[PDB]
């Protein structure tokens, strides 16, 4: 056909695919793939969602939380797009929790946080020797953020309470108190921005 026309038609179909995605993620991806606007590979779908241009963060999280094989592969590729080397756990969490909004269903959140924990540990080999320590401490940080910054939680845990709540999780030992302190202060001073 002709180049200018084809480009303009493609750009509007792309805009349509975004709206479709935002109503129903699987249908949006289907429209873009069938119209040759997106390659149907786990990494190309993950880059598309990571860019997130005109996409609702809730719908990104909904797609990433589906149980079928391709969605799990896209989730793993999406987490691999995040660079976490030399970031502390809070810095890495701020970045991750901004790229999409977590689904409500506990089983979907579990898959997503497990994938995060694996990426953080692979990127920072010295920090946590167990992915279970990273997973548990990630939820501790998320809950601390709610406790310190939600006015409905009366009596916010102090640093000593936060240290004592996490004893025993570092392969039977404790995490360095300087690590716990730095995470606590980072959260006290700057709440997570949730999309």
Cα dihedral sign for 192, 73, 86, 129?
positive
- List active site positions: 105
Boundaries of every domain in the chain = 1-82, 83-195
Phi and psi torsions of 170, nearest 5°:
-100, 80
Q: How far apart are the first and last CA of the chain?
A: 41
Question: In sequence order, what DSSP letters do the residues of 69-125 get, joined into one string?
Answer: HHHHHHHHHHHHTS--TT--HHHHHHHHHHSS---S-HHHHHHHHHHHHHHHHHHST
CATH code that applies to domain 1-82 = 1.10.220.20
d(CA 193, CA 195): 6
Report resolution in angstroms.
Answer: 2.0
d(CA 60, CA 54): 11
| Token pair for 67 | 């149980």
* Secondary-structure class of domain 83-195 per CATH: mainly alpha
For this PDB entry, the determination method is: X-ray
Residue 160: C-alpha distances to residues 122, 143, 156, 167, 177 (Å): 29, 15, 12, 11, 10
- The helix or strand, by DSSP H or E, that contains position 163, with its residue range, turns out to be helix 159-165
Q: Assess contact for 147 and 157: CB atoms under 8 A.
A: yes
């Amino acid at each position: 056909a002709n180049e200018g026309s084809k480009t303009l038609q493609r750009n509007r179909k792309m805009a349509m695919g975004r709206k479709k995605f935002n109503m129903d993620p699987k249908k949006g991806i289907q429209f873009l793939v069938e119209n040759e606007l997106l390659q149907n590979t786990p990494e190309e779908i993950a880059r598309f969602l990571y860019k997130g241009e005109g996409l609702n963060k809730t719908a990104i999280g909904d797609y990433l939380g589906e149980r079928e094989e391709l969605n799990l592969a896209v989730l793993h590729a999406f987490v691999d797009l995040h660079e976490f080397t030399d970031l502390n756990l809070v810095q890495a969490l701020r970045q991750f929790l901004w790229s999409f909004r977590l689904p409500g269903e506990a089983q979907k959140i579990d898959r997503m946080m497990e994938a995060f924990a694996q990426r953080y540990c692979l990127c920072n080999p010295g920090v946590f020797q167990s992915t279970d320590t990273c997973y548990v401490l990630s939820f501790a940080v998320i809950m601390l953020n709610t406790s310190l910054h939600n006015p409905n939680v009366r009596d916010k845990p102090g640093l000593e309470r936060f240290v004592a709540m996490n004893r025993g999780i570092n392969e039977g030992g404790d995490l360095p108190e300087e690590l716990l302190r730095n995470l606590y202060d980072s959260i006290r001073n700057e709440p997570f921005k949730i999309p």
